[PDB]
């Protein structure tokens, strides 16, 4: 034994006598053996203040001796190029190492090697972090982290060994990692390395989804060059033979649902094994057992292979598992966004039965808002309950507001300067506000918005615009006029289905025309409005105050957002003038894309586009010439100039304030004002009908490694505009512009990929059937107009 009269200290500096005592098990007066002293030492270490401790028996007095860890007095850097002194400083406080705390001296070489892996992720494998610790007069240390990051390492080959039915290139075609990028070009992934897991996953699926049921990735080695600048990658594989599916035998805790699972597993006998149909099945089961209360259904499938007839008998093991209940759903980190802002994206109902999906579905539904940097789930069993859980979503909040600027460069547009500012989550309420402007050759647009994405709990949005558009028609390749409009719309957005939406909203427009060079059509509209300005000059003005009911319906079941290979897109907009407007018209436009692949690999898609437009007046009035439908250039019928299809200007004789120098003029007094002049200036119509037929094929001269990056097609475009209120009789001499059987057809070849200057799209069309006064334009393009 041994009895202690006092506890006495040597080496306490920062740690108060009181803090030492409140962590020693052995008290003043206690009876202690060398075992309870070894427990005290053991304990004072567990505090984290001390570097060495020793408790010693000194007669009647227990004596505690300490050397405290040195206080961090500065953290300089000196060497860090690729990581800023602030981003590292913050990451070090997250690891305990900060200024004013004490240095974990045995973790210095840990701190060093701890930072190497930050550098090995990007590929800086030549890197290095030393740490110079300099003692200072009063038990302080100066931590200086000397970096020497190196040449980032680039991947010089991705090889595949055993590939017999597919050239090593076709396979690599689909990997996020690339053995070569091109320039002068395709924006086509980098050339660095990390997390190759998930690229072997696509290699499995390429093989499994073609009936190679016995396919196996034997090994995947990952090499360096001695200089640690180059990186090689081999994935050695074994190709199965092709196996046809025989049947599916289901076996496990089906929770007595064999009735409904025995047809979810019914597969037409003969078709090849299909690694995704398998995981669909597996998911359909987990989605059925989930429909019936079970949170975590497991489902596995090990094919019974039979090399005799070359078939696979899929043995699916079901196991519905247990049933849990959600006591609460809780949110942590939503320090700005309202509780409701996250909770409304929950497909998991709180105070109801757990879904292993609806919790994951409600996480994908959360980061796709993009209000949060990270989104982690955590399902905790409620203490004192075998089947109650809390679902916690730990969010880290992202800076939502941003300034954006984008130059694109298209023909039928010129140079687009899209630019504006946006706040995606106004003070954390899901409300979006922003001021976007786009500036064309013909247009200067500038609108301010306020949107509620959940006006109604089910997803109905109420979005208000407030716009300003100055249109200069003679830059838009139309008859010369100037519309200077502005107004405001409120618009309900109804979500209907995963593929469908409705818009309906009211609108105000102030159209303020001026500088209208006289022509027949433009002027037939004007008598209708009760305005009779001058046939023989260009100094005019029309103020129009319109009130509109707008409505729209959009349907998108495209397989892929980028290069669609399957499914249709259908947008339908229409408006009408609510009684009390200066104008009185209804407008209805409708576009249509339809992709239809012809091969299994889906590199022979057939694109069928159609565009439709129609409107007219109601009270003996007409559709404003500015609400007209045009058809030419890239967006519509290629081979032809922008807007060049349909009716043309039949011009009055006049003079403008131009002061006729030495330029070309249309039906000017200055040059011989007879009566009316026919022109090849276009005005479009109140009745468009364009409809294309593109044949998307492989791109046949470029390396297979990235041939699927570029998309050639062969299009046959045709279109028609016409003027319905054209008096064909009164103007017997001038061409019949109420006749729509004037089908303008063209045929060309398209190319698009993604260059560094942005998304690209070329066309080259010779118009074979063009009619009287149609301006051709054979090579057209955009560089991501934005």
């Amino acid at each position: 034994g041994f009895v202690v009269k006092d506890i006495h200290f040597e080496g306490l500096q920062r740690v108060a006598v009181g803090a030492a005592l409140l962590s020693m098990p052995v008290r003043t007066g206690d009876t202690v053996n060398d075992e309870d002293i070894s427990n005290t030492i053991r304990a004072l270490f567990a505090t984290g203040n001390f570097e060495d401790v020793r408790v010693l028996r000194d007669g009647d007095t227990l004596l505690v001796q300490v050397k405290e860890r040195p206080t961090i007095a500065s953290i300089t850097f000196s060497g860090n190029k690729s990581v800023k002194d602030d981003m590292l400083k913050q990451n070090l406080e997250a690891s305990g190492v900060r200024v004013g705390e004490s240095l974990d001296r045995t973790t210095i070489a840990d701190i060093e090697k701890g930072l190497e892996d930050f550098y090995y992720s990007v590929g800086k494998y030549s890197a290095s972090v030393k740490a110079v610790v300099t003692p200072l007069p009063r038990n302080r240390v100066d931590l200086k982290l000397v970096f020497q990051e190196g040449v980032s390492a680039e991947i010089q080959q991705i090889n595949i060994v055993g590939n017999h039915a597919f050239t090593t290139d076709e396979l690599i075609s689909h990997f996020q990692l690339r053995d070569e990028v091109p320039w002068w070009v395709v924006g086509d992934r980098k050339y660095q390395k990390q997390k190759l897991a998930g690229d072997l996953e696509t290699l499995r699926s390429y093989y499994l989804d073609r009936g190679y049921a016995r396919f196996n990735i034997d090994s995947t080695q990952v090499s360096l060059t001695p200089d640690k600048k180059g990186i090689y990658v081999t994935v050695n594989i074994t190709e199965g033979d092709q196996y046809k599916l025989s049947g599916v035998e289901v076996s496990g805790n089906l929770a007595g649902h064999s009735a409904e699972i025995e047809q979810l597993t019914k597969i037409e006998p003969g078709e090849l094994y299909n690694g995704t149909k398998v995981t669909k099945m597996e998911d359909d089961i987990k989605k059925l057992l989930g429909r019936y209360g079970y949170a975590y259904p497991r489902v596995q499938s090990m094919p019974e292979i039979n090399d005799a007839d070359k078939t696979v008998k899929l043995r699916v093991n079901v196991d519905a598992g247990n049933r849990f209940y959600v006591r609460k759903i809780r949110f942590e980190g939503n320090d700005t966004s309202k509780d409701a802002v996250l909770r409304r994206e929950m497909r998991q109902m709180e105070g109801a039965w757990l879904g292993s999906d609806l919790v994951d579905q409600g996480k994908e539904r959360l980061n796709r808002l993009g209000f949060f940097e990270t989104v982690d789930t955590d399902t905790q069993r409620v203490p004192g309950s075998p089947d109650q859980v809390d679902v916690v979503y730990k969010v880290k909040e992202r800076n939502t507001g941003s300034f954006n600027f984008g130059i694109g460069y298209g023909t039928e547009s010129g140079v687009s300067f899209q630019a504006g500012v946006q706040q995606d989550n106004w003070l954390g309420t899901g409300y979006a506000v922003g001021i976007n402007g786009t500036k064309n050759d013909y247009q200067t647009y500038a609108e301010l918005s306020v949107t509620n994405p959940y006006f109604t709990v089910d997803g109905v949005s109420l979005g208000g615009r407030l716009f300003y558009n100055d249109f200069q028609a003679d830059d838009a390749d139309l008859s010369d006029y100037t519309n200077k409009s502005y107004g405001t719309d409120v618009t309900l957005g109804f979500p209907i289905n995963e593929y469908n939406s409705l818009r309906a909203g009211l609108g105000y427009v102030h159209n303020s025309l001026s500088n209208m060079q006289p022509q027949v059509a433009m002027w037939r509209y004007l008598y209708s409005m009760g305005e009779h300005p001058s046939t023989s000059d260009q100094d005019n003005s029309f103020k129009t105050d319109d009130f509109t009911f707008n409505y729209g319906w959009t349907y998108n079941k495209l397989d892929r957002g980028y290069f669609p290979t399957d499914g249709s897109r259908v947008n339908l907009t229409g408006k009408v003038t609510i009684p009390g407007s200066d104008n009185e018209y209804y407008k209805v436009t409708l576009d249509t894309a339809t992709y239809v692949p012809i091969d299994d690999d889906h590199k022979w898609v057939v694109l069928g586009r159609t565009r439709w437009g129609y409107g007219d007046g109601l009270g003996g009035k007409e559709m404003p010439f500015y609400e007209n439908f045009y058809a030419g250039g890239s967006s519509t019928v290629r081979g032809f100039q922008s807007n060049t299809i349909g009716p043309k200007a039949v011009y009055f004789p006049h003079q403008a304030s131009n002061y006729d120098p030495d330029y070309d003029y249309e039906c000017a007094t200055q040059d011989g004002a007879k009566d009316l002049c026919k022109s090849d200036d276009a005005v479009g119509g109140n009745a468009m009908a364009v409809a294309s037929l593109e044949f998307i094929t492989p791109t046949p001269f470029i390396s297979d490694k990235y041939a699927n990056s570029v998309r050639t097609s062969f299009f046959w475009d045709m279109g028609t505009v016409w003027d319905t209120n054209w008096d064909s009789s009164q103007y017997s001499g001038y061409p019949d512009w109420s006749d729509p059987s004037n089908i303008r057809m063209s045929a060309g070849i398209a190319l698009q990929w993604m260059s560094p200057l942005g998304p690209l799209v070329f066309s080259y069309a010779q118009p074979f059937k063009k009619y009287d006064g149609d301006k051709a334009e054979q090579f057209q393009f955009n560089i991501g107009k934005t």
Binding site: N399, G401, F403, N404, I407, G408, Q423, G758
Partner: peptide, 9 residues
Amino acid sequence: NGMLSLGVS
């Protein structure tokens, strides 16, 4: 798109 973008507002 073109040019760039700042996210700090």
